[PDB]
């Protein structure tokens, strides 16, 4: 019944996957061994003959290091060994190695495992793909896998949780190349993609959680909370839900304009105790503050095409409507002329769950806003400009060419990005 397969690619994807599955277990009361003393959680966890609950997920990396940590870690019994796939040689921060050279060896094995998970599904909805834009596996392997998934799965829904690179936490000089190459190749294969800017997350951890030097552990816990908010509607049956298809129907007006901006609130430090409890009005107001965004950009300089508000916990519709009405009086929120109905609201009964010993405080109510704004084009522009700086001099291009890539593939990828930026510009013009 309505199953969703989660695919975690590369270090970023695997590590975020660890955070997500840890959170899902806390939310559904599943122990790290798969034991548990609703029923919608079955969309994400299958059940064995021994009454154990197993994530409907595949973890893939071209190097074994990251996944070896999962198979030694606290949740080693949660996953069956065959769903944790690793190669020997990494993609060395090279898209060409991830997509071609190294990727081509493991691709068939990964798809065989995905097929085995799909065979356990009676009503497979589709896939959730987690990966970084910057790493060679995250970029190269993901686009290779996305292409193969479109072939094998017909028109089955594919949603992405993409880690947009940040210099505070960047590991490679070539991350703009990998980012543009993966976006170009995956664009025609993805139905909806949620970008997560590592700088936005780094800044929220620093500002809201008072973490001097945020680590991936800090970043991922916060990311996991946003992913859980988006997936709560699939894993629980509330008063107001949204399936794989309804997300896309409400937020995606055109094929290529499939990049919603996520904004989460509240993000409170596990100290204090007085900084709560925030009302529905307070958390809703926080969604329109650029400081709570998952991607750095300015919505006040763009136009909205769709706004989805996903509430969780002690929330009443009357409280929500009152909050939306006051926000509507703040003229500053501009929508495109061809869009009338702006606000689609969902309420899921379960309050946000936090990791014990984590940085996040336990709150009675939280909210995740998914908005399709033309302001997200600013994130593409930043990436495109960094690509252009290096590409004008063909800096580092030889690393890709040597792996069998052609220079024409770079031109093609960049021209497609120029067309995407042009699309966001054309969409914001009135008739």
């Amino acid at each position: 019944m309505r199953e969703c397969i989660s695919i975690h690619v590369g270090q970023a994807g695997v590590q975020i996957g660890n955070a997500c599955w840890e959170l899902y277990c806390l939310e559904h009361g599943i122990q790290p061994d798969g034991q548990m003393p609703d029923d919608s959680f079955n969309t994400f966890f299958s059940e064995t003959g021994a009454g154990k609950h197993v994530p409907r997920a595949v973890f893939v990396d071209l190097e074994p290091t990251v996944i070896d940590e999962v198979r030694t870690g606290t949740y080693r019994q949660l996953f069956h060994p065959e769903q944790l796939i690793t190669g020997k040689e990494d993609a060395a921060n090279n898209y060409a190695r991830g997509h071609y050279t190294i990727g081509k060896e493991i691709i068939d094995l990964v798809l065989d495992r995905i097929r085995k998970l799909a065979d356990q599904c009676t009503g497979l909805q589709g896939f959730l793909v987690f990966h970084s834009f910057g790493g060679g596996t995250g970029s190269g392997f993901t686009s290779l896998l996305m292409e193969r998934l479109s072939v094998d799965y017909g028109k089955k829904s594919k949603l992405e949780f993409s880690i947009y690179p940040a210099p505070q936490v960047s590991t490679a000089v070539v991350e703009p190349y990998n980012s543009i190459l993966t976006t170009h190749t995956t664009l025609e294969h993805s139905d909806c993609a949620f970008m997560v800017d590592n700088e936005a997350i780094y800044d929220i951890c620093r500002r809201n959680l008072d973490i001097e030097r945020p680590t991936y552990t800090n970043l991922n816990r916060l990311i996991s909370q946003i992913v859980s908010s988006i997936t709560a509607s699939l894993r629980f049956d509330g008063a107001l839900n949204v399936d794989l298809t309804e997300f896309q129907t409400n937020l995606v007006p055109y094929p290529r304009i499939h990049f919603p901006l996520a904004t989460y609130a509240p993000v409170i430090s596990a100290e204090k105790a007085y900084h709560e409890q925030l009302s529905v009005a307070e958390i809703t107001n926080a969604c329109f503050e650029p400081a709570n965004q998952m991607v750095k950009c300015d919505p006040r300089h763009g136009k909205y095409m769709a706004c989805c508000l996903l509430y969780r916990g002690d929330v009443v519709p009357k409280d929500v409507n009152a909050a939306i009405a006051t926000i509507k009086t703040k003229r500053s929120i501009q929508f495109v002329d061809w869009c009338p109905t702006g606000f689609k609201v969902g309420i899921n009964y379960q309050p946000p769950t936090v990791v014990p010993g984590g940085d996040l405080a336990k709150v009675q109510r939280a909210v995740c806003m998914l908005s399709n704004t033309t302001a997200i084009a600013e994130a593409w522009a930043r990436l495109d400009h960094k690509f252009d700086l290096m590409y004008a001099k063909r800096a580092f291009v030889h690393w890709y060419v040597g792996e069998g890539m052609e220079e024409g593939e770079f031109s093609e990828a960049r021209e497609d990005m120029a067309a995407l930026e042009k699309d966001y510009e054309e969409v914001g013009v009135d008739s």
Partner: protein
Amino acid sequence: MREIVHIQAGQCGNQIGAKFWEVISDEHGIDPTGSYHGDSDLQLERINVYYNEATGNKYVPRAILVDLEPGTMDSVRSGPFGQIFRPDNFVFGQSGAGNNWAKGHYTEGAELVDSVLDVVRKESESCDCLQGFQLTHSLGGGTGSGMGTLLISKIREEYPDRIMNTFSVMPSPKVSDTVVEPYNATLSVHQLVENTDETYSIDNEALYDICFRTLKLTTPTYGDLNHLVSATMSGVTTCLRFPGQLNADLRKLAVNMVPFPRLHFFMPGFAPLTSRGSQQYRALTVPELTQQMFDSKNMMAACDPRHGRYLTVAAIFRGRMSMKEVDEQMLNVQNKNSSYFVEWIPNNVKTAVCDIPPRGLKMSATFIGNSTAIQELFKRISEQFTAMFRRKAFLHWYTGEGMDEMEFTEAESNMNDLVSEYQQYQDATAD
């Protein structure tokens, strides 16, 4: 990506290589018998990058020791850690190269090369995933220089897809008496431009100047110079042998450091500057370590970094220090010294911190710079070469081995092209 195969060639190569192995063995808590006696799990985490595990608790360097002359090898075996090396891995001739590149590259060297490749093949076929090779040698001699570059070419033929790394010691009038060093160096530089992926340009001119001027050692010995070499080699390899995020393998390092194929000559730097045994009881804070990156006094290549621009920089901080302080100090240096970093390679300075400091120091900093100022080292070699070549002085030693004048003209022209290439990117703009 896991194992690195180390090769030591010639007098200098074996001397520096033997010191590298006693330095890293001490850092990894390995005694001269091969037994681990340390007290930190970090020491063993990536032990497999440089050591093979022999039956039981013993660790053996994956090192091949080469010379056309037997004496140096005997001195290594007699040494402190001499017993640690694999008996079968010593490959020595009887006939010597007599500080003649032609004898090492074409005559005597060619006769021994196959016996060396037989030992490198044994080590390579034992590997789960060979990253590539690391060669230590001098460019002023005959074996290290001529045979060393011959080995590079023969290894490259059999392992064309592996990373080729070298630690090449450049000759100086200040420290050696073979009069033909400019010819041996130029003939070797021609080979390295074409055959390696990364070369650490270790300059005896800079090492002598540090010993004499900074360490106030009136008459420096090779032991004094080698203490600076081994400190640098330990620093630049930190990322490869301890668990880390940045430049964790030879390929990732190359991909982040090399923008253009031929511009793969690194200028290493080290702080603080130490003499054999000189404590290190109170010295060096984070701002102090960071400031010595632009300090020409701390460069292992006799070039002023302020006479050029950095294409890419890797900075490795070692010891117990604040990651926040490191990040602040590193950003301050890039902002203050904007003009010494190329604008067309975004986020080109990458930093890593390792908790384990090198021996005798509680805090250290290693710098790996890909600077256009390295042209000063090549210019020095070209002018010394031309002063001799103009008069065809000592050419009989090379022509007598079967060499032709054209090879000399070609090696020189190739090296001048390399200088011209550095100058081109020094003058390039982000227009």
